[PDB]
């Protein structure tokens, strides 16, 4: 009994970005700060070389925060970022085919996809842990095979 | 179960003020202009760019801090614990959702914060089905017309004494509500262990408070006297939420609001004790001013 | 940066290209790795991992494994196999009792446990914690408060 | 319009800003600017090509494009080769002033 | 001679064979730093040598990583692309290299006669990607 | 017992989505025979250690098939009326297939995870990148007569010279919008209500067998008027760049191309192409 | 539409070559790319961008 | 104490106009943490004789920044509904 | 687009799929496919006809039809006879790439 991740609402910290709504703010923060002493909004003015860096490098830092906020959420992390969620819940990524090849082309160590980690991190709770009740003495008694 | 999200803010990155960010940028500007810097270079359109940059990472150090608040359960706001509770198998439920009895008056309602956060805090105490001290608690919070539970055992082993307390009104919880915990604890307990369900396991004594506060010569005494119970009427509802004690100082500190110079207490001679078993109830209050 | 500028640039633009971005670290992924949290905000993560008992006297190697293995502890509370690892900073794994070592059908009380704890680092004190550090791992009525120790 | 100088940071407005407005067009290649890919000149593509009589008319036709985009206050008149030393050709960028 | 032109004995062999052949020899410097290639260009001055020092690297299918190519054969394919599509009288410098990724050295470049690693190599009669 | 369970479980849903063509009652019994029977494997697969590299690709062969079985049932059911479906009551039953099979697909994915979505369509940064070097036309030994160049600023311009098109005529119509308003007892009043259409019409002829200038081992091509066509289907204005009076002509969108190619070769190749281009001035700000 | 860079290929240039414009086209590329903005903007020679559709 | 006051005062408004993107309740506490705290410098600067040619360009560096901080708050606030803003009650607070 | 190879079953995508896409057009006769009668080429009708100079222009006009139907990502340039041995004529199918 787990809930799917595709029905969750969108969070607070993830933002759509715009280059213009950062750069038109930097125009609207610098033009009033000059008090009419600077009035050449032609692109060849070397402040607009730099305000298109302070709006482009900020958009990279605004995106790194959105990249790091997805990496700490289970419904959005991927790559080596579900490894950090996986290492906290004692869940490791599988090996379908083994790592070491015997031939000259190196066989890639086939890991399962990150869409199946979200299956396994979320099923790390409803899991056989200890035989407390009547429904858990029997499921922990499935060590043998010839038995109903 | 104590709220962590009401403390002073943790800063994961430091949040410097506008001046020492600005002087740090000039130290970066002198080293980059090394060998060719002149005092005529730092003109008026040059310095106002650096005053922008000192303002933008003042808004980026505030952005990293506001992102790091909403990731930790300490100071995480709404529509974001659903992203955290999905990592802890916590989904908000429906408390009379939008059923249109009539179509324009829509009445939609979800689970609020600061109790959903408790269910994320009680996530790891629901994994162990062999019944530690909190799994009997955290599985007994499945009902609505109650409050949280405390566990103890004085007698012979496999005899559990849990104290099902309930916030609905004057004290005593109904016995029909009491039978729901044995339906809530069937495949969650241990099978040899056997509980008894006592609703008031020690007894209830009637409490009051009578305070003769003073306010300053100044603002109006109508909303400030009533603001003292804003930190008190939610405090009494949080005592049996943990089942723990009230003090004399609980009757002092829950009445200090903005605009208090002295308070007064008469109803206890000494403070009372409420253990993990013992709980109590407060009947009716009367807080006026002495002036 | 200065590299993002066009090839025609003054030393002023190249200098202001190195200052006006003003890059910052993003310490946001480090909040959920207990081995990479800072020491000033580690008990924030110990709260959300529901670490029931905590001491402001341990080393950080003894503080971070209580948060990293807080899943494996809280997954199996009634077992012995996490009662072995809940006593991690007190380094002790010596001996444990079971039913058939006592011949007359168990104690009156149906075998409350008297475990063996063997500490060597701290000798003064170190007794009054283990009857309540082991309280969360102990069920409410499966055991009694009888306990055995060793220094 | 009042802008600042590229070097030395001084705010210069009338016609020294006009000349550095042209030389930000001519020496920036296309796509070198951030979030402004249709800015600059193809004159860096004309660097180190043989000076024929079709190279001259391709520079006149490309300075007129690149100044026609981001310099409306300059009407281009002509571009002329005036000297040749080893590699260093030099061009008299002549144009009337508008706006 | 791709790779076998950082040695001086073959770069002198390609030197003296060039005026017998009426060709130009596209040799290359070592893949070390700039003054290791500027001082390697000072052993010549014989009108027939075109040196491109940064050995550029190319993407590989089998390695799935970055290679190390000597970048003297890439200038030969660029000269054959120049003299047949633009004419031999056209200067074969400012034109595109295909089959290419980044260089073995990040070689900066500006406009205005700076201390750049582009103007340092070009004034030493060395071409560079 | 999943080796017996899921393979028999797909057999019920083969009867469910197919014995429901023109009826309703024959759907319910195999659907009831699956939901309480795929649960017999979704509870069986709760605890497996990843038993084999085989024996679970079989689970992937089965759960792909049961995933096809939901699509067959839910489309055959959706062809019916809702009121005929509500009286049967399988709206509240087919959702249990979205519960049990998804719990079975989560159980298979825990035991045997999926293969990674491998990437074979990874291209370099070239196949969508324009060659920014100027063509051999711009370096030719002929002064350019007129130059077409678009707004994208990286596309290849068209150069008019004796190698490419070489017009010798230049119509330049330019109206001015003066509107007449007839007054009864006097002369009609004229008002300047705009600028009107200014047009440029380029005549000329392309002879695609005359060799390029200086005998460059290359002729004037047949392609060399179709390049005017490709540059005209961009839906985009063009800067005219002459070299005699004003050089910065405005934005001029191309409207009409009409060649008259005659004196044909055997394969249809002409050796004259008399064209007439026709522009209109794009009125930018 | 996964593309591989060189050691000097840059983000706003690449998604201008792919899409044809840059209005709403860079941050949509940075959205569906894990850890792309954390890498330095003069890119290294072997990092992969999967450019999404409808920027 | 204006050397401590206004530079800390702009730090509250950096949290005000940015932790208000998709919410309302996180705006009120830094705004309350500024209005009764910029007053700690507006009452401090009532009596100064023009202390330095420096130390007051710093005030001009700060009050330009606080002037930018009004524009960030009042545009982020203006993206919301008036009825959602009236229930919060910061229409009668941002005027302070 | 990623398809599989005809022989050996291997999924090949970029340009080896492009070449086998053309050779499924050229060697299928018309009407040989099931429920797709307007698929293929009339080149099997051109098999064992004398190589005249009108046979060449009828193959260029028929490869261009059949590739124009079911191969939009190929712009055909020319088809040329390059050798003749006894019966075996061989044709350099040259075409630019689009799409």
* Cα dihedral I68, I74, I78, I79 in deg (nearest 10): -80
Let me know: does C4 contact A54? Beta carbons within 8 Å: no
Polymer length in residues for chain I: 99
Q: Does E45 touch chain G (CB under 8 A)?
A: no
In chain G, after which residues is the C-to-N distance over 2.5 Å, breaking the chain? none
Method: cryo-EM
Return all residues near F259 (Cβ < 8 A) that are at least 6 apart. F206, F225, F273, F274, F275
CB contact under 8 A, A33 and H23: no
**Is the Cβ pair B12, C112 closer than 8 Å?**
no
Is the CB of G44 inside 8 Å of chain F's CB atoms? Answer: no
Q: Of the candidates F120, F266, F267, which has its C-beta nearest I2's C-beta?
A: F120
Q: Are B150 and B202 within 8 A, CB to CB?
A: no
Ramachandran assignment for B259, one of left (phi > 0), alpha (psi -120 to 50 degrees), beta (any other): left
Cα pseudo-dihedral B147, B149, B155, B159, rounded to 10? 100
Per DSSP, A95 falls in state B
**Euclidean distance between CA atoms G37 and A66, whole angstroms:** 9
CA dihedral H76, H80, H82, H84 (to 10 degrees): -120
- Residue B166: alpha-carbon gap to chain centroid: 18
Contact C90, C126 (CB under 8 A): yes
Residue A110 sits at the chain F interface (C-beta within 8 Å): yes
Pick the residue from chain A with its C-alpha nearest to F112.
A96
In chain H, which residues have their Cβ closer than 8 Å to the Cβ of B18? 7, 10-11, 61-62, 65
The β-bridge partners of F178 are F192
Nearest residue of D to residue C6 by CA position? D32
Q: Which H/E stretch holds residue H41?
A: helix H25-42
Count of alpha carbons within 13 angstroms of residue D30, beta-carbon side: 24
Interface membership of H10 toward B (CB under 8 Å): yes
Which 3 state secondary structure label does DSSP give B211? Answer: strand
Within 8 A of G26 by CB-CB distance, chain D residues are 35
Question: Is A12 in Cβ contact with H23 (below 8 Å)?
Answer: yes
In DSSP notation, chain F reads -HHHHHHHHHHHHHHHTTTTSS-SHHHHHHHHHHHHHHHHHHTGGGS-----SSSSHHHHHHHHHHHHHHHHHHHHGGGS-HHHHHHHT-HHHHTTHHHHHHHHHHHHHHHSPPPP------EESSTTS---S--TTTTSSS--SEEEEESSSSSPPEEESTTT------EEEE---EEEE--SSSPPEEEE-----EEEEE--EE-TTSBPTTT-S-BPPSTTTHHHHHTTTT---EEEE-SSS-SEEEEEEEEE---EEES--TTS--SEEE--EEEEEE---
- To one decimal, the resolution in angstroms is 3.5
3-state secondary structure of I9: coil
What residues are paired with E56 via a beta bridge? Answer: E103
Report the residue of A82, A91, A92, A94 to disrupt the F interface, i.e. the one with the largest count of F CBs within 10 Å.
Answer: A94
Selected for mutation to probe chain G from A13, A17, A54 (highest G CB count within 10 Å) is A17
Pairing between strand D89-97 and I74-84? unpaired
Find chain C residues with C-beta within 8 A of A85's C-beta.
Answer: 32
- Closest chain B C-alpha to D4 CA, distance in angstroms: 7
Count the Cβ atoms, other than its own, within 10 Å of residue I16. 12
Give which of H7, H8, H13, H14 to mutate to test B binding, by max B Cβ within 10 Å. H14
Are the Cβ atoms of C71 and A50 closer than 8 angstroms? no
* Torsion F225-F227-F230-F231 (CA) sign: negative
A5 at the C interface (CB within 8 A)?
no
B-proximal residues of C, 36-65, CB under 8 Å: 38, 40-41, 44-45, 47-50, 52
CA-nearest residue to A17 within chain G is G27
Q: Which of G1, G2, G3 to mutate to test the interface with F (most CBs of F within 10 A)?
A: G3
Q: Do A28 and H71 touch (CB under 8 A)?
A: yes
Whether A67 and G38 lie within 8 Å, measured CB to CB: yes
C143 touches chain B (CB under 8 A): yes
Distance CA D55, CA F213 (A): 15
CB F9, CB F59: distance < 8 Å: no
G and D touch with 3+ CB pairs <8 Å, answer: yes
> How far apart are alpha carbons F127 and F130 in whole angstroms?
8
Of F40, F42, F102, the closest CA to residue F70 belongs to F102
DSSP-based three-state secondary structure for G2: strand
Report C:14-53 residues touching G (Cβ under 8 A). 26
H64 interaction partners in chain B (CB closer than 8 Å): 51
> CA-to-CA distance for B224 and B289, rounded, in angstroms?
11
Q: Which residues of H touch B8 (CB under 8 A)?
A: none
Grouping H, G, I as helix, E, B as strand and the rest as coil, residue H91 is: helix
* CB contact at 8 A, B85 and B15: no
Cα separation, E38 vs E53, whole angstroms = 9
Cα dihedral B110, B113, B116, B120 sign: positive
| Pure H helices in chain E | 8-21, 34-41, 73-82, 119-123
D66 by DSSP, 3-state: which? helix
Which residue, among G45, G21, G50, has the nearest Cα to G35 in the 3D structure?
Answer: G50
């Amino acid at each position: 009994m787990i809930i799917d991740l595709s029905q969750l609402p969108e969070p607070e910290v993830i933002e759509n970005l715009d280059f213009e709504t950062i750069y038109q703010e930097l125009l609207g923060d610098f033009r009033e700060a000059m008090a009419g002493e600077w009035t050449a909004e032609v692109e060849s003015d070397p402040v607009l070389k730099l305000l298109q860096l302070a709006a482009y490098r900020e958009l990279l830092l605004r995106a790194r925060i959105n990249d790091a906020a997805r990496a700490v959420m289970l419904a959005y992390a991927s790559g080596a970022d579900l490894d950090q969620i996986g290492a906290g819940f004692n869940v490791q990524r599988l090996l379908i085919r083994p790592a070491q090849p015997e031939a000259v082309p190196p066989v890639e160590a086939q890991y399962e996809s990150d869409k199946s980690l979200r299956n396994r991190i979320q099923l790390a709770f409803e899991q056989l842990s200890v035989a407390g009740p009547r429904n858990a003495y029997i499921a922990h008694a499935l060590g043998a095979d010839g038995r109903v | 179960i104590i709220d962590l999200s009401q403390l002073p803010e943790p800063e994961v990155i430091e949040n410097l003020d506008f001046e020492t960010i600005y002087q740090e940028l000039l130290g970066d500007f002198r080293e980059a202009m090394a060998g060719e810097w002149t005092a005529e270079v730092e003109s008026d359109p040059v310095l106002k760019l650096l005053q922008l940059a000192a303002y933008r990472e003042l808004l980026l150090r505030a952005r990293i801090n506001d992102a790091a608040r909403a990731v930790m359960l300490a100071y995480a706001s709404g529509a974001d614990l659903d992203q955290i509770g999905a990592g802890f198998n916590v989904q908000r439920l429906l408390i009379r959702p939008a059923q249109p009895e009539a179509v324009p008056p829509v009445e939609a309602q979800y689970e609020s914060d600061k109790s959903l956060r408790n269910r994320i805090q009680l996530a790891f105490e629901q994994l162990s089905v062999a019944g530690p001290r909190n799994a009997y608690i955290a599985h007994a919070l499945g009902a609505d017309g109650r409050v949280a539970d405390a566990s103890a055992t004085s007698p012979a082993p496999c005899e559990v004494l849990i104290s099902v307390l309930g916030v609905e009104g004057n004290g005593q919880a109904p016995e029909a509500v009491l039978q729901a915990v044995r339906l809530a604890l069937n495949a969650e307990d241990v099978r040899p262990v056997a509980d008894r369900v006592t609703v008031r396991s020690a007894g209830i004594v009637p409490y009051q408070v009578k305070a003769q506060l003073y306010l300053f010569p100044g603002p109006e005494a109508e909303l400030i006297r009533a603001a003292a119970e804003a930190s008190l009427r939610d405090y009494i509802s949080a005592q049996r939420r943990l089942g723990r004690d009230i003090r004399r100082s609980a009757l002092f500190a829950t009445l200090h609001v903005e605009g208090v110079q002295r308070v007064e207490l008469q109803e206890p001679a000494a403070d009372v004790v409420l253990d993990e078993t013992q709980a109590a109830y407060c009947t009716g209050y009367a807080i006026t001013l002495g002036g | 940066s200065s590299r993002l500028l066009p090839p025609n640039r003054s030393s002023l633009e190249r200098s202001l290209g190195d200052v006006l971005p003003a890059e910052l670290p993003v310490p946001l992924r480090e909040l959920h790795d207990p081995a990479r949290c800072e020491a000033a905000l580690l008990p924030y993560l110990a709260w959300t991992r529901s670490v029931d008992r905590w001491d402001p006297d341990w080393s950080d190697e003894a503080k971070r494994n209580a948060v990293a293995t807080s899943f494996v502890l809280h997954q199996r509370k009634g077992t012995l196999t996490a009662l072995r690892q809940v006593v991690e900073p007190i380094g002790a794994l010596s001996e444990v009792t079971e039913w058939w070592q006592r011949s007359p059908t168990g104690v009156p009380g149906t075998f409350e446990i008297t475990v063996d704890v063997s500490d060597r680092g701290i000798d003064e004190g170190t007794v009054l914690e283990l009857e309540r550090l082991l309280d969360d791992v102990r069920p409410v009525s499966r055991h009694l408060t009888r306990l055995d120790l060793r220094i | 319009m009042i802008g600042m100088d590229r070097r030395s940071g001084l705010p210069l407005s009338g016609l020294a800003h006009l000349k550095q407005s042209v030389e930000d067009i001519l020496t920036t290649p296309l796509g070198s600017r951030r979030m402004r890919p249709e800015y600059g000149s193809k004159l860096r593509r004309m660097v180190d090509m043989p000076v024929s009589e079709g190279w001259k008319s391709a520079v006149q036709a490309e300075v007129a494009r690149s100044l026609g985009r981001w310099e409306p206050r300059i009407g281009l008149s002509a571009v002329r080769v005036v000297a040749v030393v080893d590699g260093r050709v030099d061009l008299l960028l002549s144009g009337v002033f508008e706006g | 001679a791709p790779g076998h032109s950082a040695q001086q004995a073959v770069a002198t062999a390609m030197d003296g064979l060039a005026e017998k052949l009426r060709a130009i020899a596209i040799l290359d410097g070592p893949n070390s730093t700039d003054e290791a290639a500027v001082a390697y260009a000072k052993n010549f001055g014989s009108k027939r040598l075109f040196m491109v020092d940064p050995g550029v690297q190319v993407w590989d299918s089998a390695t799935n990583a970055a290679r190390n190519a000597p970048a003297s054969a890439y200038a030969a394919g660029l000269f054959a692309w120049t003299d047949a599509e633009y004419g031999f009288w056209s200067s074969p410098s400012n034109k595109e290299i295909k089959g290419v990724t980044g260089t073995s050295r990040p070689v900066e470049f500006l406009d205005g006669d700076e201390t750049c690693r582009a103007n340092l190599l070009n004034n030493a009669n060395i071409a560079t990607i | 017992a999943y080796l017996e369970q899921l393979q028999a479980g797909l057999r019920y849903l083969g009867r469910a989505g197919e014995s429901g063509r023109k009826s309703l009652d024959k759907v319910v019994a195999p659907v009831n025979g699956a939901i309480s029977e795929i649960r017999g494997a979704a509870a069986e697969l709760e605890n497996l250690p990843g038993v084999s590299p085989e024996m679970a690709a079989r689970l992937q062969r089965a759960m792909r098939g049961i995933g096809q079985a939901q699509g067959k049932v839910n489309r055959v059911v959706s062809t019916y009326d809702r009121a005929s479906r509500a009286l049967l009551g399988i709206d509240e039953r087919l959702d249990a297939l979205k519960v049990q099979v998804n719990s079975a697909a989560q159980a298979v994915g825990k035991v045997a995870g999926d293969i990674s979505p491998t990437l074979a369509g990874v291209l370099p940064s070239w196949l969508l990148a324009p060659s920014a070097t100027p063509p051999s036309e711009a370096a030719a030994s002929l002064p350019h007569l007129l130059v077409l160049q678009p707004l994208t600023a990286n596309a290849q311009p068209f150069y008019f010279n004796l190698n490419t098109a070489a017009f010798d005529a230049l119509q330049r119509n330019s109206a001015y919008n003066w509107s007449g308003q007839v007054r009864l007892g006097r002369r009609p009043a004229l008002q300047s209500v705009g600028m009107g259409e200014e047009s440029i019409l380029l005549k000329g002829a392309v002879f695609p067998l005359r060799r390029q200038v200086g005998n460059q081992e290359k002729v004037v091509g047949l392609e060399q008027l179709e390049a005017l066509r490709r540059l005209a289907e961009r839906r985009e204005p063009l800067i005219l760049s002459s070299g005699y009076g004003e050089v910065q002509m405005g934005l001029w969108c191309l409207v009409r191309i009409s060649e008259n190619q005659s004196a044909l070769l055997g394969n249809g190749a002409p050796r004259k192409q008399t064209f007439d281009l026709e522009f209109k001035r794009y009125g930018d700000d | 539409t996964t593309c591989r860079t060189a050691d000097g290929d840059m983000l706003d240039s690449l998604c201008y070559h792919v899409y044809g414009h840059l209005l709403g086209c860079v941050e949509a590329t940075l959205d569906a790319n894990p850890g792309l903005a954390d890498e330095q903007q003069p890119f290294r020679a072997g990092l992969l961008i999967s450019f999404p559709d409808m920027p």
